[PDB]
Scaffold this active site. Structure first.
Site, PDB file in Angstrom:
ATOM      1  CB  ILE B  10      39.499  47.692  52.674  1.00  0.00           C
ATOM      2  CG1 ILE B  10      38.753  46.473  53.217  1.00  0.00           C
ATOM      3  CG2 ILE B  10      39.361  48.860  53.631  1.00  0.00           C
ATOM      4  CD1 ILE B  10      39.522  45.697  54.252  1.00  0.00           C
ATOM      5  N   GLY B  11      39.126  47.246  48.957  1.00  0.00           N
ATOM      6  CA  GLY B  11      39.823  46.702  47.781  1.00  0.00           C
ATOM      7  C   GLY B  11      39.292  45.433  47.126  1.00  0.00           C
ATOM      8  N   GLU B  12      39.360  45.398  45.794  1.00  0.00           N
ATOM      9  CA  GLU B  12      38.881  44.274  44.989  1.00  0.00           C
ATOM     10  C   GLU B  12      39.917  43.145  44.913  1.00  0.00           C
ATOM     11  N   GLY B  13      39.707  42.106  45.727  1.00  0.00           N
ATOM     12  CA  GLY B  13      40.674  41.026  45.928  1.00  0.00           C
ATOM     13  C   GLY B  13      40.651  39.985  44.834  1.00  0.00           C
ATOM     14  CB  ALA B  14      41.476  36.356  45.026  1.00  0.00           C
ATOM     15  N   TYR B  15      38.889  37.269  43.616  1.00  0.00           N
ATOM     16  CA  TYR B  15      37.778  36.997  42.668  1.00  0.00           C
ATOM     17  C   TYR B  15      36.847  38.192  42.462  1.00  0.00           C
ATOM     18  CB  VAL B  18      38.316  42.566  50.516  1.00  0.00           C
ATOM     19  CG1 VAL B  18      38.489  42.459  52.027  1.00  0.00           C
ATOM     20  CG2 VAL B  18      38.823  41.307  49.834  1.00  0.00           C
ATOM     21  CE  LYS B  34      39.601  36.877  48.250  1.00  0.00           C
ATOM     22  NZ  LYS B  34      41.041  36.420  48.287  1.00  0.00           N
ATOM     23  CG  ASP B 136      49.357  38.264  44.100  1.00  0.00           C
ATOM     24  OD1 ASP B 136      49.827  39.052  43.233  1.00  0.00           O
ATOM     25  OD2 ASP B 136      48.181  38.431  44.494  1.00  0.00           O
TER      26      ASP B 136
HETATM   27  C1  LQQ Z   1      41.663  38.320  52.168  1.00  0.00           C
HETATM   28  C2  LQQ Z   1      42.963  38.922  52.609  1.00  0.00           C
HETATM   29  O1  LQQ Z   1      43.976  38.267  52.717  1.00  0.00           O
HETATM   30  C3  LQQ Z   1      43.013  40.392  52.907  1.00  0.00           C
HETATM   31  C4  LQQ Z   1      42.831  40.886  54.203  1.00  0.00           C
HETATM   32  C5  LQQ Z   1      42.660  39.993  55.401  1.00  0.00           C
HETATM   33  C6  LQQ Z   1      43.016  42.334  54.427  1.00  0.00           C
HETATM   34  C7  LQQ Z   1      42.734  42.952  55.721  1.00  0.00           C
HETATM   35  N1  LQQ Z   1      42.831  44.278  55.852  1.00  0.00           N
HETATM   36  C8  LQQ Z   1      43.001  45.084  54.784  1.00  0.00           C
HETATM   37  N2  LQQ Z   1      43.033  46.417  55.070  1.00  0.00           N
HETATM   38  C9  LQQ Z   1      43.105  47.462  54.209  1.00  0.00           C
HETATM   39  C10 LQQ Z   1      43.488  47.283  52.885  1.00  0.00           C
HETATM   40  C11 LQQ Z   1      43.552  48.378  52.046  1.00  0.00           C
HETATM   41  C12 LQQ Z   1      43.239  49.640  52.540  1.00  0.00           C
HETATM   42  N3  LQQ Z   1      43.303  50.767  51.690  1.00  0.00           N
HETATM   43  C13 LQQ Z   1      41.968  51.412  51.618  1.00  0.00           C
HETATM   44  C14 LQQ Z   1      42.018  52.669  50.754  1.00  0.00           C
HETATM   45  N4  LQQ Z   1      42.598  52.373  49.453  1.00  0.00           N
HETATM   46  C15 LQQ Z   1      43.770  51.511  49.326  1.00  0.00           C
HETATM   47  C16 LQQ Z   1      43.824  50.377  50.353  1.00  0.00           C
HETATM   48  C17 LQQ Z   1      42.865  49.770  53.878  1.00  0.00           C
HETATM   49  N5  LQQ Z   1      42.807  48.698  54.676  1.00  0.00           N
HETATM   50  N6  LQQ Z   1      43.136  44.555  53.525  1.00  0.00           N
HETATM   51  C18 LQQ Z   1      43.067  43.219  53.270  1.00  0.00           C
HETATM   52  N7  LQQ Z   1      43.238  42.689  52.031  1.00  0.00           N
HETATM   53  C19 LQQ Z   1      43.406  43.601  50.885  1.00  0.00           C
HETATM   54  C20 LQQ Z   1      44.560  43.267  49.946  1.00  0.00           C
HETATM   55  C21 LQQ Z   1      44.039  43.457  48.517  1.00  0.00           C
HETATM   56  C22 LQQ Z   1      42.532  43.758  48.578  1.00  0.00           C
HETATM   57  C23 LQQ Z   1      42.126  43.581  50.040  1.00  0.00           C
HETATM   58  C24 LQQ Z   1      43.189  41.268  51.833  1.00  0.00           C
HETATM   59  O2  LQQ Z   1      43.309  40.761  50.687  1.00  0.00           O
END
Ligand code: LQQ
Ligand code: CA
EC number: 2.7.11.22
Lengths: 244, 282
Positions: B10-15, B18, B34, B136
């Protein structure tokens, strides 16, 4: 290179002051500083704390680094046992952790080890603090109260920059001393302010006039306030690099 | 170390990245993982990571409904390799991005628009009143739960603000940056509200408002809309064009966040009380 200027949201909102006092009630009471210790005394602490202070001062780290270095170090020295041939390391890892949080350019390992154990060996002593404290690293610092107190006391804003610079400098030193480790961060700050105000009146009112108010603000008795001033004013005087 | 199994990323976070994964020992439900690959260079735990956990841990006894929750930090030191980190959070169903992408025509209902805005500002208020700035703020960091609740996520650029502290000139992603940051100026909380100004708009018009490419262009883009202010404000075009389907009170709030001068830009607290919000939770 840029610096944090005044932000009414973070500085003049009464409920900010309100939450500092609240989150102050989170870290509980060291009934006696370093009780858990079965080797290093408090004398050892004063020494390591002046080395850690000098480190922060001479590398010009943001004023809130040291207090937090102190707070980490302390919290940490219940959870684990320290030693004399190992404190240098631990304290070094506190500044390193503190810098990582509260300052934009944090104290590097090579900076910290070379001055002082291998840099591998220091990286563990970080890991080990982190997991010991279970990463719950932050803390209400005596520092954090400075502007919120100036604001609450209705001190003209144009005095904030000097007053800040001056009393943060004295709080930071005061923190080196044993007995200061026990006082509530709000109070250490109120003390820092009054001592500072005392020496060069800064064209405020004089020290006297803020005693009854800080007692209202913080919700301690006036005696307590009058005491903590003397106390912090002392802690400052007892700074002495020769002990190194 | 072995309580989990990764599903989708569900996405490439800070470093790094995730992952979406399930917990086994618990109810079988979902966890947000993460992965942080600490470079066996020589700096210890990443700055960004230590900070982000510390802030989240610090506020957790408040249990704020509009902020993400951290459950754990794994850490397994390797003498055969570098360390790696499992950082474990509550999972949330989707982000604002995907949600804006999935929502049926004609886009999100105005009353949802109002509520998401509300929750978002509400979580912000909280964060600022504890002297934390989450610098951010972007649609990918704003999380929407299944019941349609708001969580601010990725706290890896957040920090406690203190007078006269040193600042990196480099904060917020391009699109949602504020003029003060672009101008290489000193900055603080109003930065978050600028972002919420931008986001507010991205809700109505399901497309980012200020889409730059350089900082200088990113700035012009903004100034193309908001207009050149006076000598006083330096340290147009009627908005409804760029934001059709917006109510008159939604507009006033939207401008109030998109004020050039930061010291003029509205705060969360006063924004939470702006007449746009009367209709809501009531
Ligand atoms: C470490 C974080 O603070 C955190 C958490 C807890 C979180 C939880 N659920 C998410 N749930 C998500 C987040 C994104 C999606 N989509 C999936 C399909 N593509 C676009 C995004 C679906 N579910 N996404 C999360 N993120 C994302 C933000 C940027 C990269 C990770 C996070 O940082
Ligand atoms: Ca610095």
């Amino acid at each position: 290179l840029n610096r944090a200027k005044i932000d009414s949201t973070t500085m003049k909102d009464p409920r900010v002051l309100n939450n500092l006092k609240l989150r102050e009630l989170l870290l509980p009471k060291f009934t006696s500083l370093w009780e858990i210790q079965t080797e290093v005394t408090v004398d050892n602490r004063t020494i390591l704390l002046t080395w850690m202070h000098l480190l922060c001062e001479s590398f010009e780290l943001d004023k809130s680094v040291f207090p937090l270095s102190v707070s980490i170090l302390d919290r940490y020295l219940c959870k684990k046992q320290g030693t004399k041939k190992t404190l240098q390391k631990i304290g070094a890892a506190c500044v390193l952790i503190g810098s990582k949080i509260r300052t934009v350019k944090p104290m590097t390992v090579s900076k910290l080890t070379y001055l002082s154990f291998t840099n591998l060996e220091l990286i563990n002593q970080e890991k080990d603090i982190l997991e010991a404290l279970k990463w719950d690293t932050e803390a209400v610092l005596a520092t954090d109260f400075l502007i919120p107190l100036c604001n609450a006391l209705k001190i003209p804003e144009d005095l904030w920059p000097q007053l800040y610079e001056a009393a943060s400098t004295t709080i930071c030193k005061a923190l080196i001393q044993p007995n200061i480790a026990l006082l509530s961060p709000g109070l250490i700050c109120a003390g820092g302010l009054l001592t500072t105000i005392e020496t060069d009146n800064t064209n405020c009112r004089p020290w006297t006039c803020y005693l009854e108010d800080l007692s209202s603000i913080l919700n301690f008795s006036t005696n307590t306030v009058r005491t903590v001033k003397d106390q912090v004013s002392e802690a400052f005087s007892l700074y002495d690099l020769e002990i190194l | 170390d072995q309580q989990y199994e990764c599903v989708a990323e569900i996405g490439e976070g800070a470093y790094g990245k995730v992952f979406k994964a399930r917990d086994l020992k618990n109810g079988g439900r979902f966890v947000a993982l993460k992965r942080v690959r600490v470079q066996t260079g020589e700096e210890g735990m990443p700055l960004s990571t230590i900070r982000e956990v510390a802030v989240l841990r610090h506020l957790e006894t408040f249990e704020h409904p509009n902020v993400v929750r951290l459950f754990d930090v794994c850490t397994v030191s390797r003498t055969d390799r570098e360390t790696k980190l499992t950082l474990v959070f509550e999972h949330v169903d989707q982000d604002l991005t995907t949600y804006l992408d999935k929502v049926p025509e004609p886009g999100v209902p105005t009353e949802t628009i109002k509520d998401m805005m509300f929750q978002l500002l509400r979580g912000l208020d909280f964060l600022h009143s504890h002297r934390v700035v989450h610098r951010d703020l972007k649609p990918q960091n704003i999380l929407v739960t299944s019941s349609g609740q708001i969580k601010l996520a990725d706290f890896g650029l957040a920090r406690i603000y203190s007078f006269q502290m040193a600042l990196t000139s480099v904060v917020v992603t391009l699109w949602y940056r504020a003029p003060e940051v672009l101008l290489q100026s000193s900055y603080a909380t109003p930065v978050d509200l600028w972002s919420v100004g931008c986001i507010f708009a991205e809700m109505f018009r399901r497309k980012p408002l200020f889409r730059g490419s350089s900082d200088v262009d990113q700035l012009g883009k903004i100034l193309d809309v908001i207009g050149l202010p006076g000598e006083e404000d330096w340290p147009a075009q009627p908005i409804e064009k760029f934001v059709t389907d917006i109510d008159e009170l939604g507009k006033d709030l939207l401008l109030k966040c998109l004020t050039f001068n930061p010291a003029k830009r509205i705060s969360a607290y006063s924004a939470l009380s702006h007449p746009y919000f009367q209709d809501l939770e009531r």
